[PDB]
Design a protein around this ligand. Sequence first.
Ligand SMILES: CCOCCOc1ccc(-c2cn(C[C@@H]3NC[C@@H](O)[C@H]3O)nn2)cc1
Ligand SMILES: CCOCCOc1ccc(-c2cn(C[C@@H]3NC[C@@H](O)[C@H]3O)nn2)cc1
Ligand SMILES: CCOCCOc1ccc(-c2cn(C[C@@H]3NC[C@@H](O)[C@H]3O)nn2)cc1
Ligand SMILES: CCOCCOc1ccc(-c2cn(C[C@@H]3NC[C@@H](O)[C@H]3O)nn2)cc1
Lengths: 448, 448, 448, 448
Amino acid sequence: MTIFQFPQDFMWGTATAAYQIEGAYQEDGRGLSIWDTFAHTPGKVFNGDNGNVACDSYHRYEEDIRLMKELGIRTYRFSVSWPRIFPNGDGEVNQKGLDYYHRVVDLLNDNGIEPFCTLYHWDLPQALQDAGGWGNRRTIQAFVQFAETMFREFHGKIQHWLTFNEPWCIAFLSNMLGVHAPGLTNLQTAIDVGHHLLVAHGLSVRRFRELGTSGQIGIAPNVSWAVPYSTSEEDKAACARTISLHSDWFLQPIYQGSYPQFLVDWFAEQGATVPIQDGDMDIIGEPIDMIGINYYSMSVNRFNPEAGFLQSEEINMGLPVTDIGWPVESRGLYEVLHYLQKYGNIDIYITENGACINDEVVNGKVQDDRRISYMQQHLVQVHRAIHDGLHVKGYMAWSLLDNFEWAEGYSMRFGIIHVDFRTQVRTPKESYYWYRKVVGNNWLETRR
Amino acid sequence: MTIFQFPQDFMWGTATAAYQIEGAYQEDGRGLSIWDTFAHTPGKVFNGDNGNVACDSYHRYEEDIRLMKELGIRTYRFSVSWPRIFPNGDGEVNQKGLDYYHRVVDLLNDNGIEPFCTLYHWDLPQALQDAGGWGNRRTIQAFVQFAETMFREFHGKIQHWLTFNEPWCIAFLSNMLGVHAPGLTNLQTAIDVGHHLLVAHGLSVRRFRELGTSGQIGIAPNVSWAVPYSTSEEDKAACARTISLHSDWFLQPIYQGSYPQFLVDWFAEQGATVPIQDGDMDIIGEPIDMIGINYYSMSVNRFNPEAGFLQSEEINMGLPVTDIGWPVESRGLYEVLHYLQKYGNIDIYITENGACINDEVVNGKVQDDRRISYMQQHLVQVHRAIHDGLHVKGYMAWSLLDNFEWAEGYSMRFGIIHVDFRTQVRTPKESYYWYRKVVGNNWLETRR
Amino acid sequence: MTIFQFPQDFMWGTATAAYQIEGAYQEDGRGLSIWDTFAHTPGKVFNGDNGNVACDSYHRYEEDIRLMKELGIRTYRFSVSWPRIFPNGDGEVNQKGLDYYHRVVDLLNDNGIEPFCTLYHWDLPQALQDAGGWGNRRTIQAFVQFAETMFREFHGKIQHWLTFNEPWCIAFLSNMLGVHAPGLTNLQTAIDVGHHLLVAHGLSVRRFRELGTSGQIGIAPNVSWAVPYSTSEEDKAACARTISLHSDWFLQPIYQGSYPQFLVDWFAEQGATVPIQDGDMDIIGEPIDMIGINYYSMSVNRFNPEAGFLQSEEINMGLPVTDIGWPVESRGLYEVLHYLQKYGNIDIYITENGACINDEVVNGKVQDDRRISYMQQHLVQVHRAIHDGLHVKGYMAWSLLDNFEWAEGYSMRFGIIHVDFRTQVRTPKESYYWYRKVVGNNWLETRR
Amino acid sequence: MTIFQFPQDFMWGTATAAYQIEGAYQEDGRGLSIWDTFAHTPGKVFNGDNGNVACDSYHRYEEDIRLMKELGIRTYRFSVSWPRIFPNGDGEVNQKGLDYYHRVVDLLNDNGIEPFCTLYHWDLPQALQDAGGWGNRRTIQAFVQFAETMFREFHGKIQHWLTFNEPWCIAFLSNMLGVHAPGLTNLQTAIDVGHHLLVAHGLSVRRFRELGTSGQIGIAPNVSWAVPYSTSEEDKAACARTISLHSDWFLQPIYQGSYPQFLVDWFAEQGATVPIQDGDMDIIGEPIDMIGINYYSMSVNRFNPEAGFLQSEEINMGLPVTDIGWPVESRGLYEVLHYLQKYGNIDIYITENGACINDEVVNGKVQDDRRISYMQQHLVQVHRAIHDGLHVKGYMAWSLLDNFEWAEGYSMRFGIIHVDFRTQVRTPKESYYWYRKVVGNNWLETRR
Ligand SMILES: CCOCCOc1ccc(-c2cn(C[C@@H]3NC[C@@H](O)[C@H]3O)nn2)cc1
Ligand SMILES: CCOCCOc1ccc(-c2cn(C[C@@H]3NC[C@@H](O)[C@H]3O)nn2)cc1
Ligand SMILES: CCOCCOc1ccc(-c2cn(C[C@@H]3NC[C@@H](O)[C@H]3O)nn2)cc1
Ligand SMILES: CCOCCOc1ccc(-c2cn(C[C@@H]3NC[C@@H](O)[C@H]3O)nn2)cc1
């Protein structure tokens, strides 16, 4: 009914992460990450699921890349298992680790797919976590040597780099709420991890510039959007806190060399402060070429004193929800793209966007109409913002494959391709074929 | 997950219209209305459907009222067939017309249901339409004699009155776009009808005050909400035009004694002007106790020169739609309730809200979960605004019964009770039972 | 997509026959007809079905008439059981016979339904068949006394009369092919019966005029249409023979005081001649106000010497067929209406038209979409001919009720209302509700 | 029930077109056709479908030919992608283009299948369309060099040639109604294209004779049949206009050296004339060995002034329709075969006949009974005309494969073999196996 045409050089993609798809968790000298530890602890992951085999992408990468070529996709966002390159994050490199990523990347380049390399997608080596992990400044040095090895090793092979994925998850979800590895629950150690992340980021960007590594580099925050239930100041502040901790808390330092004062005041009142040393802010402010934003959902939030450390209560507006229980409201993606212009018209990529739709293989196909419906609403909002002159450069569907969805295990399916975890059979879903017509035409026809 | 508690004295209701449910179109001296004429003209109504029998509520009113009592509802909004009281609108009254409404209203009052009486729900007698209908200032005097008869006839029996329902439909849909009776397509005659409506309204309110008739009186505009695709001025103006013609065009005169200048300028440029005579604005500005608003849907609109007389193009955002193809975005009801505060914190009733869900009787019941889902999102927005201190006094579900949906005939089901047009059997839908617990508890819990 | 508007005064109806629906075959002094005898003989009727109970319309006439009123139909075509009025056709009248038809007819007139009375619908009393039946000139006088009694008995109560139904069936199907009662197979006795029919017709029309009985009278031939497979003369002649024996053989005498010479020559060569006495042609030529035509199907026929007594072989064109195996080609009705203009622009009624669709009651209703599809194509052809200025005055659906379909018994359903022969339950089919809107609107819209 | 025996040497076939099945739209130096351009323009083709891969017959031709051999078919009608031989239609030939058609044709001849080569099946090179395409007389020269190359290249390999397929579509559908590539809407440029087509045809036939190329050559018009709703002259003229523009407009010049005067007068009154130069009619009148006729549907048409440029309104006779909404009335094929005898008893081939039936693979088979039913009715009409002594030499089912149905995309299935456009899997439908018994026996038994 309406036609939405995309810019000529718009980067269509699909996204995965090492621990979620790779498997082969003990092969070719791989050391245990914090997620190996976490998935092997009873009660941490639904149904006791772990990434031991996952989608076995370590061996099946040839098949996955063939399905990407047939998709006619332009970029493929993957993540490097740190413990595959530095099993202890010690400085003793694993050449078998590198060899795998060279095979993967070399195939992508031969098939005219541009690699989009996330260095850190939560697989911190357990060796570093034994010594305090991201709460220890020693990890900052460890990450930079990892970042450096990859920059040196895959120079000219990779033109698009992200240091970290979803810092809010790595810091606050992993160390405040205890939902993700390593599953702590302390305001102060989350803030510590958060700050050390940014220093490790800055220094890795610095080395990239010093090495004159090929391409462009950035960070990929998960981005929350909240809207106030009331015209009340207290409800507006609750939304501000929710929005700012996901985006502003990591982006204001990188772009404006400071933390959001109102959140520093909020945390200080809970007896937490940012462990800021001399030259830390200078390092963090090291200019970056683009950001990724991961958008999934938006919410209506009311002030509530008993509603967690941000005193921001999500309200059930009665909206329809994905199989993981997230409401679908595409206009949040439009709102957050406009909100992020406070940092200027930066080059933004949608590095993750997708829906949890648990439809399985019936008569040889997956009839995931609800995933097509989700994607349709969200790609309108991407066009809508490009048309407002915002520099949205690309869109990457989460995910290429049904994968290990962290603490939900294999129970929540985000993939555009169905994966059977008994047989490792790939079945492209209806969404795969619908998307193949949205990337190859480079326009979208909204109709149902 | 979230609980929404309503004010103590909040008015729960259901809504119908005479032509849509009554039937008995030739019985007890009823004269033909413009809708009888329109429904009897081939190509005007889908499948050649007409209101000749409809839900046969003329004879089955006892059954419908029993189903309302079991619903535990507090108000009932109905409309009077003008041509049942004045078959020619000539001043010769029909006692059989009045007797029916006395039987209906007397039952409602005996069952502790408060009647909410809409005088005009598009039933214009054909006798007056032969003379030019609402385009002829003659109808204004005709309507006031009708209004007066009802005021005097049902004084103390009825405490809630609306002069007109959806003026935008009566004027612009009926006389500009030609979709509704009497199906003309002339900018000038629509504006004429629109103006004459307001004069007839003012004078009827005046007589109500002069008669010291029991209760309170108002008008019930259908209310559009549009949001711009772009931050562009042209796109914002297109939305303003769309929003203002539905609400502002009838409400600005009643509340601020003028027409929206920007729409007068817009129309003037198409060679149309308002036939405003001396003291017309004074009549129209006669104070009213409250308004009804009919809300259904919301839209995203772009400026487009070839997109009808308002040059406002609705965009398909890929959102899910009701069976009549309207998208559901409850937050429009919240936005428009805030927008209407430009006339101050007036007493507002939701006189119509509902979804077209065509589920039929299967294993003895209707499984209209999508209607419950719709109602749930919208009743959150009603709570949301009451909580912002807005004087939203009540909510009336459109509709009590599957009825004659005008130009769609019986093909679109809005009812909360299923009606088999073959047998005139009433089957309360799942929505009826869901709604019965919301109005009886006087709170709502969101889930699904 | 296309709208077909009918003339203001167009007569909408349904049609039944006494033996097919009445039942009560021994009640109130009814004498056995030839069909009672035939249905009681093994191998004559499929499954040994008979009209002993049928639809029990003798007792259930009140119910059937109510369903007609709700249909909004204008005419009702029924037939009189001769042996109910004259059990022996001997001149001793049965007052109980008449009383039933007075009850039926009086209800029809009270409900504003115009009776359309067929005197002979194959009910010949067995007493007359013992004496040679229609092959004996004795029956001619017997029929006229019957015709007369009814004319005098129901004067002013009935305004539309047919002497005979489907003469071709009564004569050739019943006495040449042996398919229908009394099931003979002799060219000569068929031609005899055929001739005696016409004399009985002429004399009955004469008495109607002499009695100055109220209304108009005619005959209702079943009408075949055949089209040649080849442009060959022999194939064209085969069609002519097939067409002429159904229509021309009874209509040429009534309208042009002769038999089709080419068929007399054809039969004469098989040693058959018409037993025409002095003044017979004069009697037969008694002017009539209108005809009925019964149309169902059309065919493509080849000359074939071994293809029955008419040497006309029907060819299977692979067309789709009704459940009784007749192909649907509506354009035959248009062709035959034009062909019959050889007798001038006479007043024609479609006294029978319908399809055999054996859909049963499923989830409280009959989904006989193929019957609606059939009726739709045929009512276009009725409009098409009226638009060519042909005097087609009415249309009567065969049948109101699933009935006793002669030699097929209850296995072929032609009814527009379902009848459960187990329980005598009436269930209006989808066709009933579809037809109800065509006759009430008095226009038709083609779709599906 | 009836047996229809075909002549001994009757040519059974199946038909495809290059753009509809080939795919490989950029491979081995292929230049863009006007259909590549048209399919890549948003809003031109349903669902944004294009022939980029189609059935991938460029690579899968071996499989398709094996399925033809198992069918026991005698002829295979295919079309040559002009832009595969002359990517710019410039005169620089592509040897890789020729090599493909030599591989295809050589396989057909080895398998005893007779190639039936359509030179032009709408794939005009975009290079020529940039310069005005068929509206430019330069294209005439371009086509003749193409025609010539193929004649020289495949002499003795191919014995059956068609210059153009469906001229009415190429001219009027493509350039008057704008439905097909290149999607113009101008009476005059359609007539231009139409005339230039005929000159290009004549000159190509001339070269064929001069080259003494092996076999016989013709043209394949799509053939409409219309029948008047009324006996009125104006309704008869409307049909004449509809019939003549499809057939007579291209056939009267080839066979009688003139255009239908009544259509020249009709067009002249709309300010259009045929751009006829000296020797044009002489060229067009170059004798031809046979025609193809493409028959699908016939219609009932009424005169209507507002019903397009021919003022001929199709009426919905309520007949059943194929999934693409065309009514099935086989007797049109019989009527048009008789009508075409105005050019004498020419050798006619049914080069296209088929139904759109969208049945998909269920339990390993396609249950396309409606396609068998369609084919059955139409093959009776082919026998019927052969039996009238008409020189109908052959029948080619449209289509071998589900293909790219132009502006309907992949949504409308005409194939006798099912194709999955995700996996390129061929599944012979029930129609394939039914037809295999109609070609191999060389008789047909009409029964259902
Ligand atoms: C008690 C309530 O519970 C609180 C848990 O709160 C969350 C919030 C958000 C998430 C979340 C998961 N994803 C998908 C992944 N994105 C990064 C990529 O690697 C995907 O695999 N995004 N957000 C999970 C849990
Ligand atoms: C060709 C497309 O052009 C635009 C169609 O134009 C409209 C606009 C609006 C409506 C419409 C119908 N309703 C529901 C009733 N409200 C009053 C009450 O009695 C309900 O029965 N609201 N709006 C229909 C048609
Ligand atoms: C062995 C095959 O040999 C040929 C069969 O021969 C026929 C011919 C025609 C019919 C036939 C049945 N009807 C319907 C009734 N019309 C009158 C009305 O009362 C309906 O109940 N019409 N024609 C049956 C059998
Ligand atoms: C607004 C109403 O719309 C007007 C569109 O009018 C038509 C008419 C006719 C056709 C048509 C398509 N075919 C099948 C192909 N035959 C040639 C072969 O290559 C097949 O692929 N035949 N006729 C399409 C569209």
